[PDB]
Design a protein around this motif. Structure first.
Motif, PDB file in Angstrom:
ATOM      1  N   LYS B   9       0.884  -1.160   0.000  1.00  0.00           N
ATOM      2  CA  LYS B   9       0.000   0.000   0.000  1.00  0.00           C
ATOM      3  C   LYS B   9       0.935   1.226   0.000  1.00  0.00           C
ATOM      4  N   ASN B  89      -5.589   2.148  -7.657  1.00  0.00           N
ATOM      5  CA  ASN B  89      -5.562   1.626  -6.283  1.00  0.00           C
ATOM      6  C   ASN B  89      -4.642   2.393  -5.333  1.00  0.00           C
ATOM      7  N   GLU B  92      -4.491   2.125  -1.310  1.00  0.00           N
ATOM      8  CA  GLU B  92      -5.223   0.924  -0.938  1.00  0.00           C
ATOM      9  C   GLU B  92      -4.224  -0.255  -0.765  1.00  0.00           C
ATOM     10  N   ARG B  94      -3.082  -3.885  -1.744  1.00  0.00           N
ATOM     11  CA  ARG B  94      -3.247  -4.747  -2.911  1.00  0.00           C
ATOM     12  C   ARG B  94      -2.252  -5.875  -2.855  1.00  0.00           C
TER      13      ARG B  94
END
Lengths: 159, 156
Positions: B9, B89, B92, B94
């Motif tokens: 992230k 993303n 976030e 992932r």
């Protein structure tokens, strides 16, 4: 990025009813190493002569590699194929003998540790596997000919 | 059987994607899945070929933990969009990479310094060093700051 050094492992052992001690491609090489350019060390690295590691910014490959620090220098060991490498024979009984050579770039071989994948043929021609020489000594008995087979006082050095 | 997954992230500025290629150095601390034994700072690439005994398969990393004749292994697993973290993303968590581990538990991950970034104006930056969790650079032609800040990561 390196000076390449050629490094030999020499062994010596006292032989009883052994024709040759040797190892194959499965053999597990075990070393304690040190950074040739710093105080850093790494114990019990393990590798085989068949291992294929692609070196960054090179077309060559290595059997073992380490990036000693956050800086972009990669250090390598390669087993060097020499003929009748990795064999010690009756005739060498109790004599020092070159066993295996390695090219090392950025790495010093400090301590060697014999493993337990050696192979022994005795004078009656039968083969023993998983021969353990980590404790420097090994024997078995040829039931067929009622014959003790032994390897004693295994000694080695890395130079 | 489950894959072990490295998740990350970060806060991106003007980054199209953070990714890595074949040369990327995977760095972990690991533990025997059956004992207290550990090994720190193992290193491999996804292209490393080590022959596994008793199998046609190869591994990117292996270790014999004790003198018992048994080898434990890590192999990189290709998965959908692996090794790429994208603008969409931003900020976030992932999944970034997957690993098939046998006899080995991955305990700690260490980002290395050969990440790649593509900025939002098409420019590529090589040898992106995120081992200290932050990176920036600059796109001169387009007069824009490009960066990855407060990288966070886990493996399990």
């Amino acid at each position: 990025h390196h000076h390449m050094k050629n490094t030999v492992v020499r062994i010596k052992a006292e032989l009883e009813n052994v024709k040759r001690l040797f190892c194959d491609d499965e053999y597990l090489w075990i070393f304690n190493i040190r950074d040739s350019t710093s105080s850093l060390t790494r114990d019990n690295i393990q590798f085989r002569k068949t291992d294929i590691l692609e070196i960054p910014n090179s077309r060559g490959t290595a059997n073992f590699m380490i990036k000693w620090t956050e800086y972009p220098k990669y250090s390598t060991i390669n087993f060097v194929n020499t003929k009748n490498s990795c064999s010690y024979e009756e005739v060498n009984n109790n004599e020092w003998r070159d066993f295996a050579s390695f090219e090392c770039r950025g790495i010093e071989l400090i301590d060697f540790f014999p493993s337990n994948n050696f192979i022994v043929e005795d004078t009656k021609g039968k083969l023993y596997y998983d021969v353990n020489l980590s404790d420097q000594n090994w024997c078995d008995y040829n039931e067929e000919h009622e014959m003790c087979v032994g390897i004693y006082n295994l000694e080695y050095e890395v130079n």
